[PDB]
Amino acid sequence: MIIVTNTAKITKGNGHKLIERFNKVGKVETMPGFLGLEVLLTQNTVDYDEVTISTRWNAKEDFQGWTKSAAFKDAHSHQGGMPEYILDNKIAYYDVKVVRMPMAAA
Amino acid sequence: MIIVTNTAKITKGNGHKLIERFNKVGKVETMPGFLGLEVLLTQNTVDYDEVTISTRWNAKEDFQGWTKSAAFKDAHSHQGGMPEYILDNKIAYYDVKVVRMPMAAA
Ligand code: HEM
Ligand code: HEM
Structure with missing residues:
Protein backbone atom coordinates (compact mmCIF):
# COMPACT_ATOMS: atom_id res chain seq x y z
CA MET A 1 0.00 0.00 0.00
CA ILE A 2 1.33 3.47 -0.89
CA ILE A 3 0.30 7.09 -0.45
CA VAL A 4 1.21 9.78 -2.97
CA THR A 5 1.00 13.38 -1.74
CA ASN A 6 1.04 16.71 -3.57
CA LYS A 12 -2.06 33.34 2.64
CA GLY A 13 -5.84 33.23 2.49
CA ASN A 14 -5.92 31.52 -0.93
CA GLY A 15 -5.95 27.89 0.26
CA HIS A 16 -9.72 27.63 -0.11
CA LYS A 17 -9.40 28.14 -3.87
CA LEU A 18 -7.40 24.97 -4.37
CA ILE A 19 -9.67 23.01 -2.02
CA GLU A 20 -12.78 24.00 -4.00
CA ARG A 21 -11.16 22.59 -7.15
CA PHE A 22 -10.97 19.10 -5.60
CA ASN A 23 -14.34 19.30 -3.82
CA LYS A 24 -16.25 17.27 -6.40
CA VAL A 25 -16.56 13.72 -7.70
CA GLY A 26 -13.94 12.98 -10.33
CA LYS A 27 -12.38 10.16 -12.33
CA VAL A 28 -9.36 9.15 -10.22
CA GLU A 29 -11.86 7.43 -7.87
CA THR A 30 -12.74 4.92 -10.62
CA MET A 31 -9.17 3.68 -11.17
CA PRO A 32 -8.12 0.12 -10.25
CA GLY A 33 -6.45 -0.15 -6.87
CA PHE A 34 -7.45 3.38 -5.82
CA LEU A 35 -8.21 3.43 -2.10
CA GLY A 36 -9.04 7.07 -1.30
CA LEU A 37 -8.21 10.72 -1.88
CA GLU A 38 -8.21 13.37 0.86
CA VAL A 39 -7.52 17.11 0.86
CA LEU A 40 -5.93 18.57 4.00
CA LEU A 41 -5.43 22.12 5.22
CA THR A 42 -2.43 22.53 7.52
CA GLN A 43 -3.07 24.18 10.90
CA ASN A 44 -1.15 27.15 12.27
CA THR A 45 0.65 28.25 9.10
CA VAL A 46 1.78 31.81 9.72
CA ASP A 47 2.60 33.64 6.47
CA TYR A 48 1.13 31.11 4.00
CA ASP A 49 -1.51 28.42 3.47
CA GLU A 50 -0.64 24.74 2.96
CA VAL A 51 -3.02 22.39 1.14
CA THR A 52 -2.19 18.69 0.73
CA ILE A 53 -3.80 16.39 -1.83
CA SER A 54 -3.24 12.79 -0.73
CA THR A 55 -4.06 9.66 -2.74
CA ARG A 56 -3.77 6.08 -1.42
CA TRP A 57 -3.20 3.03 -3.64
CA ASN A 58 -2.87 -0.73 -3.38
CA ALA A 59 0.48 -0.39 -5.13
CA LYS A 60 2.66 2.06 -7.00
CA GLU A 61 1.78 0.47 -10.33
CA ASP A 62 -1.89 1.35 -9.73
CA PHE A 63 -0.91 5.01 -9.34
CA GLN A 64 1.25 4.74 -12.44
CA GLY A 65 -1.66 3.30 -14.40
CA TRP A 66 -3.71 6.34 -13.48
CA THR A 67 -1.05 8.87 -14.52
CA LYS A 68 -0.91 7.17 -17.94
CA SER A 69 -4.70 7.16 -18.22
CA ALA A 70 -6.88 9.32 -20.43
CA ALA A 71 -8.76 10.68 -17.39
CA PHE A 72 -5.47 11.99 -16.00
CA LYS A 73 -4.91 13.82 -19.30
CA ASP A 74 -8.49 15.13 -19.16
CA ALA A 75 -8.09 16.24 -15.52
CA HIS A 76 -4.77 17.91 -16.45
CA SER A 77 -6.12 19.80 -19.47
CA HIS A 78 -8.15 22.91 -18.58
CA GLN A 79 -6.45 23.69 -15.25
CA GLY A 80 -5.82 27.29 -16.29
CA GLY A 81 -2.18 26.32 -15.74
CA MET A 82 -0.62 26.48 -12.30
CA PRO A 83 -2.50 29.29 -10.51
CA GLU A 84 -0.55 32.38 -9.55
CA TYR A 85 -1.29 31.90 -5.81
CA ILE A 86 0.86 28.72 -5.78
CA LEU A 87 4.26 29.52 -4.29
CA ASP A 88 5.70 25.99 -4.08
CA ASN A 89 4.68 22.40 -4.81
CA LYS A 90 6.25 19.21 -3.41
CA ILE A 91 5.38 15.63 -4.38
CA ALA A 92 6.23 12.70 -2.12
CA TYR A 93 5.71 8.94 -2.10
CA TYR A 94 5.22 6.96 1.09
CA ASP A 95 5.21 3.25 1.84
CA VAL A 96 2.58 2.26 4.40
CA LYS A 97 4.36 0.11 6.97
CA VAL A 98 1.96 -0.20 9.89
CA VAL A 99 -1.81 0.31 10.15
CA ARG A 100 -3.45 0.18 13.60
CA MET A 101 -7.25 0.47 13.58
CA PRO A 102 -9.52 1.53 16.47
CA MET A 103 -10.88 -0.79 19.13
CA ALA A 104 -14.41 0.47 18.31
CA ALA A 105 -14.11 -1.35 14.96
CA ALA A 106 -12.20 -4.45 16.18
CA MET B 1 -11.92 15.12 11.31
CA ILE B 2 -8.24 15.93 11.92
CA ILE B 3 -4.85 14.33 11.37
CA VAL B 4 -1.83 14.70 13.66
CA THR B 5 1.55 13.72 12.24
CA ASN B 6 4.93 13.31 13.93
CA LYS B 12 19.78 6.46 7.03
CA GLY B 13 19.32 2.73 7.53
CA ASN B 14 17.85 3.06 11.05
CA GLY B 15 14.24 3.89 10.11
CA HIS B 16 13.15 0.28 10.69
CA LYS B 17 13.83 0.69 14.44
CA LEU B 18 11.19 3.38 14.83
CA ILE B 19 8.73 1.49 12.62
CA GLU B 20 9.34 -1.56 14.83
CA ARG B 21 8.51 0.40 18.00
CA PHE B 22 5.06 1.16 16.58
CA ASN B 23 4.44 -2.32 15.14
CA LYS B 24 2.39 -3.67 18.03
CA VAL B 25 -0.94 -3.04 19.71
CA GLY B 26 -0.74 0.09 21.81
CA LYS B 27 -3.08 2.09 24.01
CA VAL B 28 -3.88 4.91 21.57
CA GLU B 29 -6.26 2.53 19.69
CA THR B 30 -8.38 2.43 22.86
CA MET B 31 -8.95 6.20 22.99
CA PRO B 32 -12.44 7.59 22.30
CA GLY B 33 -12.64 9.31 18.93
CA PHE B 34 -9.52 7.59 17.57
CA LEU B 35 -9.95 6.66 13.92
CA GLY B 36 -6.68 5.02 13.00
CA LEU B 37 -2.90 5.18 13.14
CA GLU B 38 -0.45 4.46 10.36
CA VAL B 39 3.32 4.53 10.03
CA LEU B 40 4.86 5.65 6.73
CA LEU B 41 8.34 5.42 5.24
CA THR B 42 9.07 8.14 2.67
CA GLN B 43 10.52 6.85 -0.60
CA ASN B 44 13.72 8.11 -2.27
CA THR B 45 15.15 9.94 0.74
CA VAL B 46 18.85 10.45 0.12
CA ASP B 47 20.80 11.22 3.30
CA TYR B 48 18.34 9.79 5.79
CA ASP B 49 15.24 7.80 6.60
CA GLU B 50 11.99 9.65 7.19
CA VAL B 51 9.34 7.95 9.31
CA THR B 52 5.91 9.51 9.78
CA ILE B 53 3.48 8.44 12.47
CA SER B 54 0.02 9.65 11.55
CA THR B 55 -3.04 9.48 13.82
CA ARG B 56 -6.57 10.34 12.73
CA TRP B 57 -9.23 11.69 15.10
CA ASN B 58 -12.90 12.57 14.92
CA ALA B 59 -12.24 15.97 16.51
CA LYS B 60 -9.40 17.98 18.01
CA GLU B 61 -10.97 17.38 21.42
CA ASP B 62 -10.45 13.62 21.09
CA PHE B 63 -6.74 14.05 20.44
CA GLN B 64 -6.54 16.51 23.33
CA GLY B 65 -8.22 13.92 25.55
CA TRP B 66 -5.56 11.40 24.55
CA THR B 67 -2.66 13.73 25.31
CA LYS B 68 -4.21 14.43 28.74
CA SER B 69 -4.59 10.73 29.56
CA ALA B 70 -2.54 8.64 31.98
CA ALA B 71 -1.72 6.40 29.01
CA PHE B 72 -0.01 9.26 27.13
CA LYS B 73 1.86 10.28 30.29
CA ASP B 74 3.14 6.73 30.84
CA ALA B 75 4.06 6.33 27.15
CA HIS B 76 5.97 9.64 27.44
CA SER B 77 7.55 9.12 30.86
CA HIS B 78 10.85 9.59 28.98
CA GLN B 79 13.10 11.00 31.74
CA GLY B 80 15.88 10.31 29.24
CA GLY B 81 16.49 11.63 25.75
CA MET B 82 15.62 10.05 22.41
CA PRO B 83 17.76 7.39 20.69
CA GLU B 84 20.81 8.73 18.88
CA TYR B 85 19.51 7.81 15.42
CA ILE B 86 16.57 10.23 15.74
CA LEU B 87 17.93 13.44 14.20
CA ASP B 88 14.85 15.67 14.16
CA ASN B 89 11.16 15.65 15.05
CA LYS B 90 8.36 17.72 13.48
CA ILE B 91 4.70 17.74 14.54
CA ALA B 92 1.90 18.95 12.26
CA TYR B 93 -1.91 19.19 12.47
CA TYR B 94 -4.29 18.93 9.52
CA ASP B 95 -7.98 19.54 9.02
CA VAL B 96 -9.60 17.12 6.58
CA LYS B 97 -11.48 19.20 3.99
CA VAL B 98 -12.47 16.68 1.30
CA VAL B 99 -12.72 12.89 1.29
CA ARG B 100 -13.27 11.08 -2.02
CA MET B 101 -13.75 7.29 -1.65
CA PRO B 102 -13.49 4.71 -4.46
CA MET B 103 -16.45 4.65 -6.85
CA ALA B 104 -17.70 2.13 -9.40
CA ALA B 105 -16.68 3.30 -12.87
CA ALA B 106 -20.25 2.90 -14.23
C1 HEM C 1 3.23 18.77 -10.29
C2 HEM C 1 2.37 19.80 -10.31
C3 HEM C 1 0.83 19.62 -10.24
C4 HEM C 1 -0.04 20.65 -10.30
C5 HEM C 1 0.32 22.14 -10.45
C6 HEM C 1 -1.38 20.12 -10.20
C7 HEM C 1 -2.56 20.84 -10.22
C8 HEM C 1 -3.81 20.30 -10.48
C9 HEM C 1 -5.08 21.00 -10.60
C10 HEM C 1 -5.26 22.53 -10.46
C11 HEM C 1 -6.04 20.11 -10.86
C12 HEM C 1 -7.53 20.47 -11.05
C13 HEM C 1 -8.20 19.73 -12.20
C14 HEM C 1 -9.07 18.63 -11.64
O1 HEM C 1 -8.98 18.38 -10.41
O2 HEM C 1 -9.83 18.00 -12.41
C15 HEM C 1 -5.42 18.79 -10.92
C16 HEM C 1 -5.99 17.54 -11.13
C17 HEM C 1 -5.64 16.47 -10.35
N1 HEM C 1 -4.35 16.15 -9.96
FE1 HEM C 1 -2.82 17.44 -10.13
N2 HEM C 1 -1.27 18.75 -10.08
C18 HEM C 1 0.06 18.39 -10.09
C19 HEM C 1 0.50 17.07 -9.98
C20 HEM C 1 -0.24 16.07 -9.36
C21 HEM C 1 0.23 15.01 -8.48
C22 HEM C 1 1.67 14.73 -8.04
C23 HEM C 1 -0.82 14.28 -8.08
C24 HEM C 1 -0.73 13.06 -7.14
C25 HEM C 1 -1.79 12.57 -6.49
C26 HEM C 1 -2.01 14.84 -8.70
C27 HEM C 1 -3.31 14.41 -8.58
C28 HEM C 1 -4.39 15.03 -9.16
C29 HEM C 1 -5.78 14.63 -9.04
C30 HEM C 1 -6.30 13.42 -8.24
C31 HEM C 1 -6.52 15.49 -9.75
C32 HEM C 1 -8.04 15.46 -9.91
C33 HEM C 1 -8.34 14.42 -10.97
C34 HEM C 1 -9.78 14.06 -10.82
O3 HEM C 1 -10.59 14.93 -10.39
O4 HEM C 1 -10.11 12.89 -11.12
N3 HEM C 1 -1.61 15.93 -9.46
N4 HEM C 1 -4.07 18.96 -10.68
C1 HEM D 1 7.85 15.72 20.98
C2 HEM D 1 8.59 14.73 21.48
C3 HEM D 1 8.12 13.26 21.50
C4 HEM D 1 8.88 12.23 21.89
C5 HEM D 1 10.35 12.33 22.37
C6 HEM D 1 8.11 11.01 21.78
C7 HEM D 1 8.55 9.73 22.09
C8 HEM D 1 7.76 8.60 22.13
C9 HEM D 1 8.19 7.26 22.45
C10 HEM D 1 9.63 6.83 22.81
C11 HEM D 1 7.14 6.45 22.39
C12 HEM D 1 7.21 4.93 22.67
C13 HEM D 1 6.07 4.45 23.56
C14 HEM D 1 5.35 3.37 22.82
O1 HEM D 1 5.99 2.70 21.97
O2 HEM D 1 4.13 3.19 23.06
C15 HEM D 1 5.97 7.24 22.02
C16 HEM D 1 4.66 6.83 21.83
C17 HEM D 1 3.78 7.41 20.94
N1 HEM D 1 3.86 8.71 20.49
FE1 HEM D 1 5.43 9.98 20.73
N2 HEM D 1 6.86 11.35 21.32
C18 HEM D 1 6.82 12.72 21.13
C19 HEM D 1 5.71 13.40 20.68
C20 HEM D 1 4.56 12.84 20.15
C21 HEM D 1 3.34 13.52 19.80
C22 HEM D 1 3.07 15.03 19.94
C23 HEM D 1 2.47 12.64 19.31
C24 HEM D 1 1.04 12.99 18.82
C25 HEM D 1 0.34 12.17 18.03
C26 HEM D 1 3.11 11.33 19.35
C27 HEM D 1 2.58 10.12 18.96
C28 HEM D 1 2.82 8.94 19.61
C29 HEM D 1 2.05 7.71 19.53
C30 HEM D 1 0.80 7.52 18.65
C31 HEM D 1 2.62 6.80 20.32
C32 HEM D 1 2.15 5.35 20.52
C33 HEM D 1 0.93 5.30 21.44
C34 HEM D 1 0.59 3.86 21.68
O3 HEM D 1 1.30 2.95 21.20
O4 HEM D 1 -0.42 3.63 22.37
N3 HEM D 1 4.38 11.50 19.86
N4 HEM D 1 6.40 8.55 21.87
Missing part, protein backbone atom coordinates in the same frame (compact mmCIF):
# COMPACT_ATOMS: atom_id res chain seq x y z
CA THR A 7 1.68 19.52 -1.05
CA ALA A 8 1.11 23.13 -2.14
CA LYS A 9 2.46 26.24 -0.39
CA ILE A 10 -0.12 28.91 -1.24
CA THR A 11 -0.33 32.66 -0.68
CA THR B 7 7.71 13.21 11.33
CA ALA B 8 11.11 11.90 12.43
CA LYS B 9 14.26 12.30 10.36
CA ILE B 10 16.38 9.29 11.20
CA THR B 11 19.92 8.17 10.43
Whole structure:
Protein backbone atom coordinates (compact mmCIF):
# COMPACT_ATOMS: atom_id res chain seq x y z
CA MET A 1 0.00 0.00 0.00
CA ILE A 2 1.33 3.47 -0.89
CA ILE A 3 0.30 7.09 -0.45
CA VAL A 4 1.21 9.78 -2.97
CA THR A 5 1.00 13.38 -1.74
CA ASN A 6 1.04 16.71 -3.57
CA THR A 7 1.68 19.52 -1.05
CA ALA A 8 1.11 23.13 -2.14
CA LYS A 9 2.46 26.24 -0.39
CA ILE A 10 -0.12 28.91 -1.24
CA THR A 11 -0.33 32.66 -0.68
CA LYS A 12 -2.06 33.34 2.64
CA GLY A 13 -5.84 33.23 2.49
CA ASN A 14 -5.92 31.52 -0.93
CA GLY A 15 -5.95 27.89 0.26
CA HIS A 16 -9.72 27.63 -0.11
CA LYS A 17 -9.40 28.14 -3.87
CA LEU A 18 -7.40 24.97 -4.37
CA ILE A 19 -9.67 23.01 -2.02
CA GLU A 20 -12.78 24.00 -4.00
CA ARG A 21 -11.16 22.59 -7.15
CA PHE A 22 -10.97 19.10 -5.60
CA ASN A 23 -14.34 19.30 -3.82
CA LYS A 24 -16.25 17.27 -6.40
CA VAL A 25 -16.56 13.72 -7.70
CA GLY A 26 -13.94 12.98 -10.33
CA LYS A 27 -12.38 10.16 -12.33
CA VAL A 28 -9.36 9.15 -10.22
CA GLU A 29 -11.86 7.43 -7.87
CA THR A 30 -12.74 4.92 -10.62
CA MET A 31 -9.17 3.68 -11.17
CA PRO A 32 -8.12 0.12 -10.25
CA GLY A 33 -6.45 -0.15 -6.87
CA PHE A 34 -7.45 3.38 -5.82
CA LEU A 35 -8.21 3.43 -2.10
CA GLY A 36 -9.04 7.07 -1.30
CA LEU A 37 -8.21 10.72 -1.88
CA GLU A 38 -8.21 13.37 0.86
CA VAL A 39 -7.52 17.11 0.86
CA LEU A 40 -5.93 18.57 4.00
CA LEU A 41 -5.43 22.12 5.22
CA THR A 42 -2.43 22.53 7.52
CA GLN A 43 -3.07 24.18 10.90
CA ASN A 44 -1.15 27.15 12.27
CA THR A 45 0.65 28.25 9.10
CA VAL A 46 1.78 31.81 9.72
CA ASP A 47 2.60 33.64 6.47
CA TYR A 48 1.13 31.11 4.00
CA ASP A 49 -1.51 28.42 3.47
CA GLU A 50 -0.64 24.74 2.96
CA VAL A 51 -3.02 22.39 1.14
CA THR A 52 -2.19 18.69 0.73
CA ILE A 53 -3.80 16.39 -1.83
CA SER A 54 -3.24 12.79 -0.73
CA THR A 55 -4.06 9.66 -2.74
CA ARG A 56 -3.77 6.08 -1.42
CA TRP A 57 -3.20 3.03 -3.64
CA ASN A 58 -2.87 -0.73 -3.38
CA ALA A 59 0.48 -0.39 -5.13
CA LYS A 60 2.66 2.06 -7.00
CA GLU A 61 1.78 0.47 -10.33
CA ASP A 62 -1.89 1.35 -9.73
CA PHE A 63 -0.91 5.01 -9.34
CA GLN A 64 1.25 4.74 -12.44
CA GLY A 65 -1.66 3.30 -14.40
CA TRP A 66 -3.71 6.34 -13.48
CA THR A 67 -1.05 8.87 -14.52
CA LYS A 68 -0.91 7.17 -17.94
CA SER A 69 -4.70 7.16 -18.22
CA ALA A 70 -6.88 9.32 -20.43
CA ALA A 71 -8.76 10.68 -17.39
CA PHE A 72 -5.47 11.99 -16.00
CA LYS A 73 -4.91 13.82 -19.30
CA ASP A 74 -8.49 15.13 -19.16
CA ALA A 75 -8.09 16.24 -15.52
CA HIS A 76 -4.77 17.91 -16.45
CA SER A 77 -6.12 19.80 -19.47
CA HIS A 78 -8.15 22.91 -18.58
CA GLN A 79 -6.45 23.69 -15.25
CA GLY A 80 -5.82 27.29 -16.29
CA GLY A 81 -2.18 26.32 -15.74
CA MET A 82 -0.62 26.48 -12.30
CA PRO A 83 -2.50 29.29 -10.51
CA GLU A 84 -0.55 32.38 -9.55
CA TYR A 85 -1.29 31.90 -5.81
CA ILE A 86 0.86 28.72 -5.78
CA LEU A 87 4.26 29.52 -4.29
CA ASP A 88 5.70 25.99 -4.08
CA ASN A 89 4.68 22.40 -4.81
CA LYS A 90 6.25 19.21 -3.41
CA ILE A 91 5.38 15.63 -4.38
CA ALA A 92 6.23 12.70 -2.12
CA TYR A 93 5.71 8.94 -2.10
CA TYR A 94 5.22 6.96 1.09
CA ASP A 95 5.21 3.25 1.84
CA VAL A 96 2.58 2.26 4.40
CA LYS A 97 4.36 0.11 6.97
CA VAL A 98 1.96 -0.20 9.89
CA VAL A 99 -1.81 0.31 10.15
CA ARG A 100 -3.45 0.18 13.60
CA MET A 101 -7.25 0.47 13.58
CA PRO A 102 -9.52 1.53 16.47
CA MET A 103 -10.88 -0.79 19.13
CA ALA A 104 -14.41 0.47 18.31
CA ALA A 105 -14.11 -1.35 14.96
CA ALA A 106 -12.20 -4.45 16.18
CA MET B 1 -11.92 15.12 11.31
CA ILE B 2 -8.24 15.93 11.92
CA ILE B 3 -4.85 14.33 11.37
CA VAL B 4 -1.83 14.70 13.66
CA THR B 5 1.55 13.72 12.24
CA ASN B 6 4.93 13.31 13.93
CA THR B 7 7.71 13.21 11.33
CA ALA B 8 11.11 11.90 12.43
CA LYS B 9 14.26 12.30 10.36
CA ILE B 10 16.38 9.29 11.20
CA THR B 11 19.92 8.17 10.43
CA LYS B 12 19.78 6.46 7.03
CA GLY B 13 19.32 2.73 7.53
CA ASN B 14 17.85 3.06 11.05
CA GLY B 15 14.24 3.89 10.11
CA HIS B 16 13.15 0.28 10.69
CA LYS B 17 13.83 0.69 14.44
CA LEU B 18 11.19 3.38 14.83
CA ILE B 19 8.73 1.49 12.62
CA GLU B 20 9.34 -1.56 14.83
CA ARG B 21 8.51 0.40 18.00
CA PHE B 22 5.06 1.16 16.58
CA ASN B 23 4.44 -2.32 15.14
CA LYS B 24 2.39 -3.67 18.03
CA VAL B 25 -0.94 -3.04 19.71
CA GLY B 26 -0.74 0.09 21.81
CA LYS B 27 -3.08 2.09 24.01
CA VAL B 28 -3.88 4.91 21.57
CA GLU B 29 -6.26 2.53 19.69
CA THR B 30 -8.38 2.43 22.86
CA MET B 31 -8.95 6.20 22.99
CA PRO B 32 -12.44 7.59 22.30
CA GLY B 33 -12.64 9.31 18.93
CA PHE B 34 -9.52 7.59 17.57
CA LEU B 35 -9.95 6.66 13.92
CA GLY B 36 -6.68 5.02 13.00
CA LEU B 37 -2.90 5.18 13.14
CA GLU B 38 -0.45 4.46 10.36
CA VAL B 39 3.32 4.53 10.03
CA LEU B 40 4.86 5.65 6.73
CA LEU B 41 8.34 5.42 5.24
CA THR B 42 9.07 8.14 2.67
CA GLN B 43 10.52 6.85 -0.60
CA ASN B 44 13.72 8.11 -2.27
CA THR B 45 15.15 9.94 0.74
CA VAL B 46 18.85 10.45 0.12
CA ASP B 47 20.80 11.22 3.30
CA TYR B 48 18.34 9.79 5.79
CA ASP B 49 15.24 7.80 6.60
CA GLU B 50 11.99 9.65 7.19
CA VAL B 51 9.34 7.95 9.31
CA THR B 52 5.91 9.51 9.78
CA ILE B 53 3.48 8.44 12.47
CA SER B 54 0.02 9.65 11.55
CA THR B 55 -3.04 9.48 13.82
CA ARG B 56 -6.57 10.34 12.73
CA TRP B 57 -9.23 11.69 15.10
CA ASN B 58 -12.90 12.57 14.92
CA ALA B 59 -12.24 15.97 16.51
CA LYS B 60 -9.40 17.98 18.01
CA GLU B 61 -10.97 17.38 21.42
CA ASP B 62 -10.45 13.62 21.09
CA PHE B 63 -6.74 14.05 20.44
CA GLN B 64 -6.54 16.51 23.33
CA GLY B 65 -8.22 13.92 25.55
CA TRP B 66 -5.56 11.40 24.55
CA THR B 67 -2.66 13.73 25.31
CA LYS B 68 -4.21 14.43 28.74
CA SER B 69 -4.59 10.73 29.56
CA ALA B 70 -2.54 8.64 31.98
CA ALA B 71 -1.72 6.40 29.01
CA PHE B 72 -0.01 9.26 27.13
CA LYS B 73 1.86 10.28 30.29
CA ASP B 74 3.14 6.73 30.84
CA ALA B 75 4.06 6.33 27.15
CA HIS B 76 5.97 9.64 27.44
CA SER B 77 7.55 9.12 30.86
CA HIS B 78 10.85 9.59 28.98
CA GLN B 79 13.10 11.00 31.74
CA GLY B 80 15.88 10.31 29.24
CA GLY B 81 16.49 11.63 25.75
CA MET B 82 15.62 10.05 22.41
CA PRO B 83 17.76 7.39 20.69
CA GLU B 84 20.81 8.73 18.88
CA TYR B 85 19.51 7.81 15.42
CA ILE B 86 16.57 10.23 15.74
CA LEU B 87 17.93 13.44 14.20
CA ASP B 88 14.85 15.67 14.16
CA ASN B 89 11.16 15.65 15.05
CA LYS B 90 8.36 17.72 13.48
CA ILE B 91 4.70 17.74 14.54
CA ALA B 92 1.90 18.95 12.26
CA TYR B 93 -1.91 19.19 12.47
CA TYR B 94 -4.29 18.93 9.52
CA ASP B 95 -7.98 19.54 9.02
CA VAL B 96 -9.60 17.12 6.58
CA LYS B 97 -11.48 19.20 3.99
CA VAL B 98 -12.47 16.68 1.30
CA VAL B 99 -12.72 12.89 1.29
CA ARG B 100 -13.27 11.08 -2.02
CA MET B 101 -13.75 7.29 -1.65
CA PRO B 102 -13.49 4.71 -4.46
CA MET B 103 -16.45 4.65 -6.85
CA ALA B 104 -17.70 2.13 -9.40
CA ALA B 105 -16.68 3.30 -12.87
CA ALA B 106 -20.25 2.90 -14.23
C1 HEM C 1 3.23 18.77 -10.29
C2 HEM C 1 2.37 19.80 -10.31
C3 HEM C 1 0.83 19.62 -10.24
C4 HEM C 1 -0.04 20.65 -10.30
C5 HEM C 1 0.32 22.14 -10.45
C6 HEM C 1 -1.38 20.12 -10.20
C7 HEM C 1 -2.56 20.84 -10.22
C8 HEM C 1 -3.81 20.30 -10.48
C9 HEM C 1 -5.08 21.00 -10.60
C10 HEM C 1 -5.26 22.53 -10.46
C11 HEM C 1 -6.04 20.11 -10.86
C12 HEM C 1 -7.53 20.47 -11.05
C13 HEM C 1 -8.20 19.73 -12.20
C14 HEM C 1 -9.07 18.63 -11.64
O1 HEM C 1 -8.98 18.38 -10.41
O2 HEM C 1 -9.83 18.00 -12.41
C15 HEM C 1 -5.42 18.79 -10.92
C16 HEM C 1 -5.99 17.54 -11.13
C17 HEM C 1 -5.64 16.47 -10.35
N1 HEM C 1 -4.35 16.15 -9.96
FE1 HEM C 1 -2.82 17.44 -10.13
N2 HEM C 1 -1.27 18.75 -10.08
C18 HEM C 1 0.06 18.39 -10.09
C19 HEM C 1 0.50 17.07 -9.98
C20 HEM C 1 -0.24 16.07 -9.36
C21 HEM C 1 0.23 15.01 -8.48
C22 HEM C 1 1.67 14.73 -8.04
C23 HEM C 1 -0.82 14.28 -8.08
C24 HEM C 1 -0.73 13.06 -7.14
C25 HEM C 1 -1.79 12.57 -6.49
C26 HEM C 1 -2.01 14.84 -8.70
C27 HEM C 1 -3.31 14.41 -8.58
C28 HEM C 1 -4.39 15.03 -9.16
C29 HEM C 1 -5.78 14.63 -9.04
C30 HEM C 1 -6.30 13.42 -8.24
C31 HEM C 1 -6.52 15.49 -9.75
C32 HEM C 1 -8.04 15.46 -9.91
C33 HEM C 1 -8.34 14.42 -10.97
C34 HEM C 1 -9.78 14.06 -10.82
O3 HEM C 1 -10.59 14.93 -10.39
O4 HEM C 1 -10.11 12.89 -11.12
N3 HEM C 1 -1.61 15.93 -9.46
N4 HEM C 1 -4.07 18.96 -10.68
C1 HEM D 1 7.85 15.72 20.98
C2 HEM D 1 8.59 14.73 21.48
C3 HEM D 1 8.12 13.26 21.50
C4 HEM D 1 8.88 12.23 21.89
C5 HEM D 1 10.35 12.33 22.37
C6 HEM D 1 8.11 11.01 21.78
C7 HEM D 1 8.55 9.73 22.09
C8 HEM D 1 7.76 8.60 22.13
C9 HEM D 1 8.19 7.26 22.45
C10 HEM D 1 9.63 6.83 22.81
C11 HEM D 1 7.14 6.45 22.39
C12 HEM D 1 7.21 4.93 22.67
C13 HEM D 1 6.07 4.45 23.56
C14 HEM D 1 5.35 3.37 22.82
O1 HEM D 1 5.99 2.70 21.97
O2 HEM D 1 4.13 3.19 23.06
C15 HEM D 1 5.97 7.24 22.02
C16 HEM D 1 4.66 6.83 21.83
C17 HEM D 1 3.78 7.41 20.94
N1 HEM D 1 3.86 8.71 20.49
FE1 HEM D 1 5.43 9.98 20.73
N2 HEM D 1 6.86 11.35 21.32
C18 HEM D 1 6.82 12.72 21.13
C19 HEM D 1 5.71 13.40 20.68
C20 HEM D 1 4.56 12.84 20.15
C21 HEM D 1 3.34 13.52 19.80
C22 HEM D 1 3.07 15.03 19.94
C23 HEM D 1 2.47 12.64 19.31
C24 HEM D 1 1.04 12.99 18.82
C25 HEM D 1 0.34 12.17 18.03
C26 HEM D 1 3.11 11.33 19.35
C27 HEM D 1 2.58 10.12 18.96
C28 HEM D 1 2.82 8.94 19.61
C29 HEM D 1 2.05 7.71 19.53
C30 HEM D 1 0.80 7.52 18.65
C31 HEM D 1 2.62 6.80 20.32
C32 HEM D 1 2.15 5.35 20.52
C33 HEM D 1 0.93 5.30 21.44
C34 HEM D 1 0.59 3.86 21.68
O3 HEM D 1 1.30 2.95 21.20
O4 HEM D 1 -0.42 3.63 22.37
N3 HEM D 1 4.38 11.50 19.86
N4 HEM D 1 6.40 8.55 21.87
